[PDB]
Write a protein that binds this ligand. Structure first.
Ligand SMILES: COc1ccc(S(=O)(=O)N(CC(C)C)C[C@@H](O)[C@H](Cc2ccccc2)n2cc(COC(=O)N[C@H]3c4ccccc4C[C@H]3O)nn2)cc1
Ligand SMILES: [Br-]
Ligand SMILES: [Br-]
Ligand SMILES: [Br-]
Ligand SMILES: [Br-]
Ligand SMILES: [Br-]
Ligand SMILES: [Br-]
Ligand SMILES: [Br-]
Ligand SMILES: [Br-]
Ligand SMILES: [Br-]
Ligand SMILES: [Br-]
Ligand SMILES: [Br-]
Ligand SMILES: [Br-]
Lengths: 99, 99
């Protein structure tokens, strides 16, 4: 799709066997979701934003599908107030900014 | 232009008579910059990021330019770890997401 920014850029993200809504966030290096079930093992990571740092759970090799486009990559789980899709997965679906 | 996301989408912004680099940040509702001078009066605002809330200074009707593209809007100044350009200004320059 071509998405304008008058409203938050919400999309549907297929992950695990479930649908979540998340923001397309070009400001985010990484994808960070609120608490959810993901399969497999995880490792610790600290990430930082406005407000400061947080610790998250890092799950690697997680398949995802955004609006019909498939990808795979690392997904972080932790206390973010918003599900956000970051550049690590946006590149894989071909997402660009344009003006 | 078309900007991909293999790296941070950094672009220069002219504001307050100066040049600054900032991140095009489609997850940001508002534009938030690191401490700098801006003219006129400011009002208080509280915004929230991944790691809690911070206090910022709100400056209205600030002219800004991005890749030749001129706009005007509200600019927040505060303790952000990164200069970010948010949707309030991105819409004004016709910036969209595409995939
Ligand atoms: C009222 O308007 C607002 C405008 C911006 C913000 S935001 O909190 O800054 N935000 C909202 C989010 C729900 C989409 C935007 C966002 O892109 C921030 C960008 C940011 C990151 C770091 C400092 C300030 C702003 N964001 C992204 C992330 C997730 O990624 C990591 O933490 N990233 C790392 C990283 C990414 C960008 C810049 C610096 C760094 C620190 C690294 O370790 N968390 N918040 C809040 C309100
Ligand atoms: Br934490
Ligand atoms: Br990745
Ligand atoms: Br939020
Ligand atoms: Br590409
Ligand atoms: Br980078
Ligand atoms: Br300058
Ligand atoms: Br700069
Ligand atoms: Br906020
Ligand atoms: Br505005
Ligand atoms: Br204005
Ligand atoms: Br335009
Ligand atoms: Br438009």
């Amino acid at each position: 799709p071509q998405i304008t920014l008058w409203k938050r850029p919400l999309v549907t993200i297929k992950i695990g066997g479930q649908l979540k809504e998340a923001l397309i966030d070009t400001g985010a290096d990484d994808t960070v979701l609120e608490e959810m079930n993901l399969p497999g093992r995880w490792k610790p990571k600290i990430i930082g934003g406005i407000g400061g740092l947080i610790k998250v759970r890092q799950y690697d090799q997680i398949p995802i599908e955004i609006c019909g486009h498939k990808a795979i990559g690392t997904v972080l789980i932790g206390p973010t107030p918003a599900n956000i899709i970051g550049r690590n997965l946006l590149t894989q679906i071909g997402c660009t900014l344009n003006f």
